Ligand binder design. Sequence first.
Ligand SMILES: Cc1nccn1-c1cccnc1
Ligand SMILES: [Zn+2]
Length: 140
Amino acid sequence: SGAIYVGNYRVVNRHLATHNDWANLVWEDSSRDLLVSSTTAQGCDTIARCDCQTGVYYCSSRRKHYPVSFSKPSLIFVEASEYYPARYQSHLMLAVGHSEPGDCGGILRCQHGVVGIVSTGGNGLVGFADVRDLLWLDEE
Ligand SMILES: Cc1nccn1-c1cccnc1
Ligand SMILES: [Zn+2]
C-alpha cells in the first residue's frame, strides 16, 4: 500500500483504489495502474520533473529503502498479474530489486521529488508507475 499526496490530490495504484477514491475521482488509467482522487487537506509530496534514472524506493516487504537505477517510462508485458488483468502496462519503469504485491504504492524518489510508485514485481525486478509526465498534479 501507499499513496502520493501532492496538493489536493491522492495518487494510488488503480487496483488499490477505495470506494472513496472512486467517489472523488479526478483521473484513472488502467493501462498505467494509476488513479487520482481529491483530498480535503494539502499533501507533503513534490513531484519530480526530470528524466532521472537513479533514485531510491521504499520496499514494505523489507522495511527498507533501496537505491536503484531504473529504465525510462515505457510499455511492458507483465506476467501472471494477480491484482489486475496480467498483460501490457504503460508508463512503467523497471529496476533490479525486490517487489511483492503488497509493496505496491511505495514511493520511488530522485533528487527532484517523487518519480512514481511501485506497481509490479517478479524475478528480482520491481516496476514503478511513472507520474512525472502528469504536470497537472502541480496545479488546480
Ligand atoms: C517485475 C516486472 N514488471 C514488469 C516486467 N517485470 C519483469 C520482467 C522480467 C522478468 N520478471 C519480471
Ligand atoms: Zn529527478
